A paper describes a structure:
ATTR amyloid fibrils were isolated from the hearts of two patients with type A Val30Met ATTR amyloid fibrils. A three-dimensional (3D) map reconstructed based on the cryo-EM images achieved a spatial resolution of 2.97 Å based on the 0.143 Fourier shell correlation (FSC) criterion. The fibril is polar, possesses C1 symmetry and consists of a single, twisted protofilament. The larger density segment fits with residues Gly57-Thr123 of TTR, the smaller density with residues Pro11-Lys35. Weak density occurs adjacent to these ordered regions, suggesting that residues Gly1-Cys10, Ala36-His56 and Asn124-Glu127 are structurally disordered or absent. The fibril cross-section shows a relatively compact protein fold that resembles the shape of a spearhead. There is an internal cavity that is lined with polar and ionic residues and probably water-filled. Stacking up the fibril proteins along the fibril z-axis generates the cross-β-sheets. All cross-β-sheets have parallel strand–strand contacts. In the N-terminal arch, an extensive hydrophobic core is formed by two leucine, one proline, one isoleucine and five valine residues as well as the variant position 30. The fibril protein fold differs profoundly from the native conformation of TTR-Val30Met, which contains nine β-strands per protomer along with a single α-helix.
Numbering used by the authors:
A (entry chain G), B (entry chain H), C (entry chain I), D (entry chain J), E (entry chain K), F (entry chain F), ...: 11 to 35, 57 to 123
The structure:
């Protein structure tokens, strides 16, 4: 007789992020899983992933170069941070 | 007799994000999963993924170059952050 | 006798995002899954994906170059962030 | 006797996004799935995907160049963020 | 005896987006699936997809160049964000 | 008779992030796992991952160079930090 | 008769991050695990991971160089630190 | 009859981080574990990890060089340190 | 009849980090553990880890050099140190 | 009838870090352990760890050099030291 | 009938670090242990650890040199030392 009670009585004006999971009971294999529920990804980089079976098997001559140079500005305010009765100013 | 009770009584004006999962019970394989419910992806990069079976198997001469240069500005305010009785100001 | 009760009584004017899953029970393989429920993708890049079976199998001479330069401005305010009794100003 | 009760009584003027899934029970394979319920895509790029079986199998000489330069401005306000009794102002 | 109850009593003037799923039970294959329910695509780009079986099989000499330059302005306000008793101004 | 009671009575306007998990009971294999519930990734880099079975098996001559140079500015304020009756100010 | 009681009565406006896990009971193998619930990653780098089975098996001549140079500024304030009745200023 | 009582009565406006785990009962193998719940990663580097089975097995001539030079500034204030009635000021 | 009572009555505005574990009862093997839940890692470096089984087994000629030079400044204030009624100033 | 009572009555505004573990009852093997509850890592270095089984087994000629030179400044104030009614000042 | 009572009544604003463990009852083997509860590691170095079984077994010619030179400044104040009604200045 499992019972879960969440934010039953809310009197007011909150700022809320609620993540709940209820569970009652082949290069890359993933099964029965929970991933990136509130995941935030900024300027992520993946070059070579899961190329495959027997790639470049014989007499491969590869030249791999990755140049991550760049003038980049992101400037996030209040990332994944709920706020209440509050002021968020991004001024440039 | 599983029972889940969430935000049953809300008196007021909140700012809410609610993610709830209730569960009662081949190069890339993924099964019976939940992913990227609130996934936020900004300027993500994937170059080579799952090319396949026996790619470049024999006598391959590849030249892989990735130039991630660039003048880029993102400037997000209140990302994935619910707010109440609040000010979100982006000024440039 | 599974029972789920969410936001049963709402008195007021909230700002709400509600994501709720109730579950009772070959280069890429994907089964019985839930993906990108509230997914946000901004300036995402995928160059080579799942090329296939035996691509460039013999005597391939490839020249792969990716130039991610560029003057780009995004400037999002209140991304995936419900707000109430609130002011969102984007001024340039 | 599964039972789901959502937003049963709403007294007021909320701003609501509701996604609910209730479930009772060959290069790319996807089965019995839910994708992009509230998915948001901005300036996404996919160059080469699922080219096929035995592409460029023998003596291929490819020149792949991708130039993602460009003067681009997006300027979204209140993306996927319901708001109530609120101001959303985009001024340029 | 599955039962789903949503927004049974609404007293007021809300702004609502309602997605509800009730489920009781070939290079690219998708089966019994749900996709792009509220998916939003802006300036998305797909160059080469599912070219086919044995394309460029022998002695192919391809020159692939993609120039994503361009003066482009999008300027969306209140994307996928229902609002109530609210003001949305896009001024240029 | 498991019972979980969280934030049952909330009188006021808090700023809350709630992650709650209730559980009652092949190069890379991941199963029965929960990951990235609130995980945030900024400027993460993965070059070569899960290349495959027997890659570069015989007489491979690879040149791997990764240049992570670049003028980059991130400038996040209030990352994953809910705030109440508060000011979040990013000035440049 | 396990019972868990968390933040039962909250009178006021706190800033809260709460993570709770309830549990009642082949190169890389991880199963039945809960990882990176509130994990934050900034400028992380992984070059070669899980290359595969018998890579560079015979007569490999690799040149691996990683240059992590770069003018980079991050400047985070209030990372994973909820604050209340407080002032967060990032000034440059 | 295990019972856990945490922060039952909170009168005021604290700044709180709460992690609670309640438990009642092959190169890399990890089982039934909880890892990096509130882990913070800044400028972490992993070069070669889990290359695989029999890599560089015979007559390998590798040149591994890692140059971690770089002008980098991080400048975090209030990392994983909730604060109340407080000032967090980053001035440059 | 195990019973745990923590911070039952909190009158005021403290700054709190709460980590509580309640427990009632193959190169690398890791079982039934909790590791680095609130561990924070800054500028950590791991070069070669778990290369694999029989790497460089015969007639290997490796040149391993690691140059950890670099102009780097971190400048953290109030790391993992909650503060109350307090002022945190980082001035450069 | 084990009973644990911690910080039952807190009247005031303290700064608190709380770690409590309550417990009632193959190169690297670790079982049923707790690690890095408040673990802090700064500029840690691990070069060669768990290379594997029979690495460099026969006729290996390795040249291992590690140069930990570098202009590096860390300058942490109030590390893992909660403070109340206090000033934390980093001036350069 | 074991009973533990800690900081039952706290009237004031102390600065507290609380670590309590309550316990009622193959190259490297580690069992049922507790490590690095408040561990702080600064500029720690581990070069060769657990290389493996029979490494450099026959006719190995290794050259191991470790140069720990470097201009490095750490300058921590109030490390793992909670303070109350106190002033912390780090001035350079």
């Amino acid at each position: 007789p499992l019972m879960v009670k969440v934010l039953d009585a809310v009197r007011g004006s909150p700022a809320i992020n609620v993540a709940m999971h209820v569970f009652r009971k082949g290069l890359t294999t993933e099964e029965e899983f929970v991933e990136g529920i509130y995941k935030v990804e900024i300027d992520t980089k993946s070059y070579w992933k899961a190329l495959g079976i027997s790639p470049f098997h014989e007499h491969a001559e590869v030249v791999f170069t990755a140049n991550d140079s760049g003038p980049r500005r992101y400037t996030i305010a209040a990332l994944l941070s709920p706020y209440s009765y509050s002021t968020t100013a991004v001024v440039t």
